[PDB]
CSV table of C-alpha atoms and ligand atoms in Angstrom, one decimal:
chain,number,residue,atom,x,y,z
A,13,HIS,CA,-23.6,18.0,-130.5
A,14,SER,CA,-20.2,19.2,-129.2
A,15,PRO,CA,-17.2,18.0,-131.2
A,16,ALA,CA,-15.9,16.9,-128.2
A,17,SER,CA,-15.0,12.9,-126.1
A,18,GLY,CA,-18.3,11.9,-124.3
A,19,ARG,CA,-15.6,10.9,-121.7
A,20,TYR,CA,-17.4,7.4,-121.8
A,21,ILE,CA,-14.9,5.4,-120.4
A,22,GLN,CA,-14.7,7.3,-117.3
A,23,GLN,CA,-18.5,7.2,-117.1
A,24,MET,CA,-18.4,3.5,-117.3
A,25,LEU,CA,-15.7,3.0,-114.8
A,26,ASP,CA,-17.5,5.5,-112.6
A,27,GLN,CA,-20.5,3.1,-112.3
A,28,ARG,CA,-18.7,-0.1,-111.8
A,29,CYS,CA,-17.5,1.8,-108.9
A,30,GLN,CA,-20.7,2.5,-107.8
A,31,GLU,CA,-21.7,-1.5,-108.1
A,32,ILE,CA,-18.8,-2.6,-106.7
A,33,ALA,CA,-19.3,0.0,-103.7
A,34,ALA,CA,-23.0,-1.5,-103.3
A,35,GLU,CA,-21.9,-4.5,-103.1
A,36,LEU,CA,-19.4,-4.4,-100.4
A,37,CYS,CA,-21.8,-2.7,-98.5
A,38,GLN,CA,-24.1,-5.7,-98.4
A,39,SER,CA,-21.0,-7.6,-97.4
A,40,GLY,CA,-21.0,-5.4,-94.5
A,41,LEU,CA,-18.5,-2.7,-95.3
A,42,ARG,CA,-20.5,0.5,-93.8
A,43,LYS,CA,-18.2,3.0,-95.0
A,44,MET,CA,-19.2,1.8,-98.9
A,45,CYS,CA,-23.2,2.4,-98.1
A,46,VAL,CA,-23.5,5.6,-99.9
A,47,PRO,CA,-25.4,7.4,-102.7
A,48,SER,CA,-23.8,7.0,-106.1
A,49,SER,CA,-23.0,10.4,-106.0
A,50,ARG,CA,-20.2,9.9,-103.2
A,51,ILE,CA,-18.2,7.2,-105.8
A,52,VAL,CA,-15.8,7.9,-108.4
A,53,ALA,CA,-13.2,5.5,-109.8
A,54,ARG,CA,-9.6,7.4,-109.8
A,55,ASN,CA,-6.5,6.1,-110.8
A,56,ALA,CA,-4.2,6.6,-107.9
A,57,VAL,CA,-2.2,5.6,-105.0
A,58,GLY,CA,-4.1,4.6,-101.8
A,59,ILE,CA,-3.2,4.7,-98.2
A,60,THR,CA,0.2,4.7,-96.8
A,61,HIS,CA,2.2,1.8,-98.5
A,62,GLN,CA,-0.5,1.8,-101.3
A,63,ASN,CA,2.3,3.8,-103.8
A,64,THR,CA,1.5,2.7,-106.7
A,65,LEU,CA,-0.9,4.0,-109.2
A,66,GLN,CA,-3.7,1.9,-109.6
A,67,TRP,CA,-7.6,2.0,-110.3
A,68,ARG,CA,-9.5,2.1,-107.5
A,69,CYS,CA,-13.4,3.1,-106.4
A,70,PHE,CA,-13.1,6.5,-104.0
A,71,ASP,CA,-15.5,7.7,-101.8
A,72,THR,CA,-15.0,11.6,-102.8
A,73,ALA,CA,-16.3,12.6,-99.1
A,74,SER,CA,-12.7,11.4,-98.2
A,75,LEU,CA,-10.7,13.0,-101.7
A,76,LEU,CA,-8.8,16.3,-100.8
A,77,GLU,CA,-9.8,19.6,-102.7
A,78,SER,CA,-6.0,19.8,-103.6
A,79,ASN,CA,-3.1,17.6,-103.8
A,83,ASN,CA,-1.0,12.0,-104.3
A,84,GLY,CA,-2.9,13.4,-107.2
A,85,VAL,CA,-5.8,11.4,-108.7
A,86,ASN,CA,-5.8,10.7,-112.3
A,87,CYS,CA,-9.4,10.0,-114.9
A,88,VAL,CA,-9.3,8.5,-117.7
A,89,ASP,CA,-9.6,9.8,-121.5
A,90,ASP,CA,-11.7,8.2,-124.2
A,91,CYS,CA,-8.3,6.6,-125.9
A,92,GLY,CA,-7.6,4.7,-122.4
A,93,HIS,CA,-4.7,7.5,-120.2
A,94,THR,CA,-4.7,8.7,-117.2
A,95,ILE,CA,-4.7,12.6,-116.7
A,96,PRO,CA,-4.6,14.3,-113.6
A,97,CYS,CA,-8.3,14.9,-112.3
A,98,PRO,CA,-9.6,17.7,-109.5
A,99,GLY,CA,-8.6,16.2,-106.1
A,100,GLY,CA,-6.4,14.4,-103.7
A,101,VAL,CA,-5.8,11.2,-101.7
A,102,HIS,CA,-5.8,11.7,-98.1
A,103,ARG,CA,-3.0,8.8,-97.2
A,104,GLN,CA,-4.2,7.9,-93.8
A,105,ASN,CA,-8.0,8.4,-94.2
A,106,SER,CA,-9.1,8.0,-97.3
A,107,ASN,CA,-12.2,5.7,-98.3
A,108,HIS,CA,-11.7,3.4,-101.4
A,109,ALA,CA,-11.5,-0.3,-103.1
A,110,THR,CA,-8.7,-0.7,-105.1
A,111,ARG,CA,-10.3,-3.0,-107.9
A,112,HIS,CA,-7.5,-3.0,-110.5
A,113,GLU,CA,-8.0,-5.8,-112.8
A,114,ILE,CA,-12.2,-5.1,-113.4
A,115,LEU,CA,-11.2,-1.6,-113.7
A,116,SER,CA,-8.1,-2.0,-116.2
A,117,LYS,CA,-10.7,-4.3,-118.3
A,118,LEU,CA,-13.4,-1.9,-119.0
A,119,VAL,CA,-10.3,0.6,-120.4
A,120,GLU,CA,-9.4,-1.9,-122.4
A,121,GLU,CA,-12.8,-2.1,-123.5
A,122,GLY,CA,-13.5,1.2,-124.2
A,123,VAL,CA,-10.6,2.3,-125.6
A,124,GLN,CA,-11.5,-0.5,-128.7
A,125,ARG,CA,-15.2,1.4,-129.0
A,126,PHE,CA,-14.3,5.1,-128.2
A,127,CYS,CA,-10.5,5.9,-129.2
A,128,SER,CA,-10.3,7.7,-132.5
A,129,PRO,CA,-7.5,5.8,-134.8
A,130,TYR,CA,-6.3,9.1,-135.8
A,131,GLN,CA,-5.6,10.1,-132.1
A,132,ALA,CA,-4.2,6.5,-131.5
A,133,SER,CA,-1.4,7.2,-133.9
A,134,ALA,CA,-0.6,10.6,-132.2
A,135,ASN,CA,-0.7,8.6,-129.1
A,136,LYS,CA,1.6,6.1,-130.3
A,137,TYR,CA,4.3,8.1,-132.0
A,138,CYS,CA,4.5,10.3,-129.1
A,139,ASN,CA,4.6,7.0,-126.7
A,140,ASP,CA,7.8,5.4,-128.8
A,141,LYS,CA,9.4,9.0,-128.8
A,142,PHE,CA,8.9,10.1,-124.9
A,143,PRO,CA,7.8,7.3,-123.3
A,144,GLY,CA,3.9,7.8,-121.3
A,145,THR,CA,3.6,11.0,-123.4
A,146,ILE,CA,0.4,11.8,-125.2
A,147,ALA,CA,-0.5,13.9,-128.0
A,148,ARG,CA,-2.6,17.2,-127.9
A,149,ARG,CA,-2.7,20.6,-129.4
A,150,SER,CA,-2.5,22.9,-126.9
A,151,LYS,CA,-0.6,25.3,-125.3
A,152,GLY,CA,3.4,25.3,-124.4
A,153,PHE,CA,5.0,27.0,-121.1
A,154,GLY,CA,3.9,30.5,-120.3
A,155,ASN,CA,1.9,31.2,-123.4
A,156,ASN,CA,-1.7,30.5,-123.3
A,157,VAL,CA,-2.7,31.5,-126.7
A,158,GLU,CA,-0.5,29.7,-129.2
A,159,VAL,CA,-1.6,25.9,-129.7
A,160,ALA,CA,0.4,22.8,-131.3
A,161,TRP,CA,0.9,19.5,-131.3
A,162,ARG,CA,3.0,17.9,-128.8
A,163,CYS,CA,3.8,15.3,-126.9
A,164,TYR,CA,2.6,15.8,-123.5
A,165,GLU,CA,3.8,13.9,-120.1
A,166,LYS,CA,0.3,13.2,-118.6
A,167,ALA,CA,1.3,14.8,-115.3
A,168,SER,CA,1.2,18.3,-116.9
A,169,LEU,CA,-2.4,17.7,-118.0
A,170,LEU,CA,-5.5,19.0,-116.7
A,171,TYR,CA,-8.8,16.8,-117.1
A,172,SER,CA,-10.8,19.4,-116.9
A,173,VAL,CA,-9.2,21.9,-119.6
A,174,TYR,CA,-10.3,20.3,-123.0
A,175,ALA,CA,-7.9,20.9,-125.5
A,176,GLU,CA,-7.8,20.0,-129.4
A,177,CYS,CA,-7.1,16.1,-130.0
A,178,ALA,CA,-7.8,14.1,-133.5
A,179,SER,CA,-11.3,12.7,-134.3
A,180,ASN,CA,-12.1,9.3,-136.1
A,181,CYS,CA,-12.5,11.1,-139.2
A,182,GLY,CA,-8.7,13.0,-138.9
A,183,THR,CA,-10.6,16.3,-138.2
A,184,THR,CA,-10.8,18.8,-135.4
A,185,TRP,CA,-11.9,17.5,-131.8
A,186,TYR,CA,-11.7,18.3,-128.4
A,187,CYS,CA,-10.2,16.1,-125.5
A,188,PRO,CA,-10.4,16.5,-121.8
A,189,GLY,CA,-6.4,16.5,-120.9
A,190,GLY,CA,-5.3,20.1,-122.0
A,191,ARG,CA,-3.1,23.1,-121.0
A,192,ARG,CA,-3.5,26.4,-119.6
A,193,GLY,CA,-0.3,27.9,-120.5
A,194,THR,CA,0.7,29.0,-117.6
A,195,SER,CA,4.2,29.1,-115.9
A,196,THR,CA,4.7,26.5,-113.5
A,197,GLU,CA,7.2,23.8,-113.9
A,198,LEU,CA,4.6,21.4,-115.1
A,199,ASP,CA,3.6,23.6,-117.8
A,200,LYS,CA,7.4,22.9,-119.1
A,201,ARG,CA,6.5,18.8,-119.4
A,202,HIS,CA,5.8,18.6,-122.8
A,203,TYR,CA,8.2,18.0,-126.5
A,204,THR,CA,6.6,20.1,-129.2
A,205,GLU,CA,6.3,17.6,-132.4
A,206,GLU,CA,4.0,19.5,-135.5
A,207,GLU,CA,5.7,17.5,-138.2
A,208,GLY,CA,6.1,14.0,-136.0
A,209,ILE,CA,2.8,14.0,-135.0
A,210,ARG,CA,0.9,15.4,-137.7
A,211,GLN,CA,2.7,12.6,-139.9
A,212,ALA,CA,1.3,10.1,-138.0
A,213,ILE,CA,-1.9,11.7,-138.4
A,214,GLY,CA,-2.0,11.3,-141.8
A,215,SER,CA,-0.4,8.0,-141.6
A,216,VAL,CA,-3.6,6.4,-140.9
A,217,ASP,CA,-6.1,4.7,-143.5
A,218,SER,CA,-9.6,6.5,-143.7
A,219,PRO,CA,-12.6,4.3,-142.2
A,220,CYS,CA,-14.4,5.4,-145.1
A,221,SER,CA,-13.9,4.8,-149.2
A,222,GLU,CA,-12.4,7.5,-151.6
A,223,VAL,CA,-16.4,7.8,-152.6
A,224,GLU,CA,-17.4,8.4,-149.1
A,225,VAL,CA,-17.4,11.6,-146.9
A,226,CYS,CA,-16.1,11.3,-143.3
A,227,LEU,CA,-18.4,12.9,-140.6
A,228,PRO,CA,-16.7,12.5,-137.2
A,229,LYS,CA,-18.3,10.6,-134.1
A,230,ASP,CA,-17.7,10.3,-130.5
A,231,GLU,CA,-17.8,6.7,-131.0
A,232,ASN,CA,-16.1,4.4,-133.8
A,233,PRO,CA,-17.3,3.7,-136.5
A,234,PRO,CA,-17.6,7.4,-137.7
A,235,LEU,CA,-20.7,8.2,-140.6
A,236,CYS,CA,-19.5,7.1,-144.0
A,237,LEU,CA,-22.1,9.2,-146.3
A,238,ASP,CA,-21.9,8.2,-150.5
A,239,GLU,CA,-20.5,11.7,-151.4
A,240,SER,CA,-23.0,13.7,-153.3
A,241,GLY,CA,-23.3,13.3,-157.2
A,242,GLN,CA,-22.8,15.6,-159.7
A,243,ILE,CA,-26.1,16.2,-159.6
B,1,LIG,C1,15.9,21.0,-128.6
B,1,LIG,C2,16.5,22.5,-129.0
B,1,LIG,O1,16.9,23.3,-128.1
B,1,LIG,N1,16.0,22.4,-129.8
B,1,LIG,C3,16.6,23.9,-130.8
B,1,LIG,C4,15.1,24.8,-131.1
B,1,LIG,O2,14.6,25.1,-129.9
B,1,LIG,C5,13.2,24.1,-129.7
B,1,LIG,O3,12.2,24.6,-130.3
B,1,LIG,C6,10.8,24.1,-130.0
B,1,LIG,C7,10.3,24.9,-131.1
B,1,LIG,O4,9.3,23.8,-132.3
B,1,LIG,C8,10.5,24.3,-128.6
B,1,LIG,O5,9.5,25.9,-128.5
B,1,LIG,C9,11.3,24.0,-127.6
B,1,LIG,O6,10.8,23.9,-126.3
B,1,LIG,C10,10.7,22.8,-125.8
B,1,LIG,C11,9.4,22.2,-126.6
B,1,LIG,O7,9.4,21.4,-127.0
B,1,LIG,O8,7.9,23.2,-126.5
B,1,LIG,C12,9.7,23.2,-124.2
B,1,LIG,C13,10.0,22.2,-123.7
B,1,LIG,O9,9.7,22.8,-122.0
B,1,LIG,C14,10.9,21.2,-123.0
B,1,LIG,N2,10.7,19.7,-122.4
B,1,LIG,C15,11.5,19.8,-121.7
B,1,LIG,C16,12.0,20.4,-121.2
B,1,LIG,O10,10.6,18.3,-120.6
B,1,LIG,C17,11.0,20.8,-124.3
B,1,LIG,C18,12.4,20.0,-125.2
B,1,LIG,O11,13.6,20.3,-124.4
B,1,LIG,C19,12.6,19.6,-126.4
B,1,LIG,O12,11.5,19.3,-127.5
B,1,LIG,C20,13.4,18.2,-126.8
B,1,LIG,O13,14.4,18.0,-127.9
B,1,LIG,O14,11.3,21.7,-125.7
B,1,LIG,C21,12.7,24.1,-128.1
B,1,LIG,O15,13.6,23.6,-127.3
B,1,LIG,C22,15.1,25.6,-131.8
B,1,LIG,O16,14.1,26.6,-132.3
B,1,LIG,C23,16.2,25.2,-133.1
B,1,LIG,C24,16.6,27.0,-133.9
B,1,LIG,O17,16.7,27.9,-133.0
B,1,LIG,O18,16.7,24.9,-132.9
B,1,LIG,C25,16.9,23.6,-132.1
B,1,LIG,O19,18.4,23.1,-132.4
B,2,CL,CL1,-10.6,11.3,-125.4
């Protein structure tokens, strides 16, 4: 068991999209009659005129290899660029924003570390739209620090440090490579402010328990070992 996000919200959205595609197929929508391996949930634009970010069930065969980028979701409900792009003329998808949004809300309650939630809230309050990671900055692929990252600048396929549900080291999808592209500048380093936000969270365990983090809330709280 790795100290890493299980990406449980994304898994649930993909499974719900597979069911929705199957239902549309039964309604006669031929292009939705596919195996489950062809269907994922992505938060993205759609065809021409569908210019807002919405949750949609996409046939992966209709997605472009690169980008109109598509976004996946972390277990605190934040959308982050994932591999691929929308073909604005040829996309094969079903927009299902309400049900998929509701599933994200339900998932956040289950899976989002209160420590990470606090760090994310600090970042969004100070720099709207940003989320917290301890990851790379611009043109340096070694150094990590707690920063408020513009979500568009993160890579879902790259895991980066985040806060567990015990306020301990954890890794989450949505990270930086430390490259030197323009996107690599889109962050605000906030070591003191993020650390304070994390330290302000009340423990799920008593002062007489050891917190062992888990990929779902709550963590394990074990009775501290006695002076045996
Ligand atoms: C704002 C400024 O110039 N501050 C001076 C200090 O510089 C900042 O130091 C921090 C170290 O914590 C960062 O290296 C700085 O760079 C970034 C960052 O926060 O990582 C780089 C980002 O690309 C940039 N984000 C953008 C352009 O979108 C981000 C923001 O500009 C700032 O965070 C906004 O506050 O900065 C760097 O700006 C300097 O260390 C100090 C003494 O030398 O004096 C500060 O005034
Ligand atoms: Cl996560």
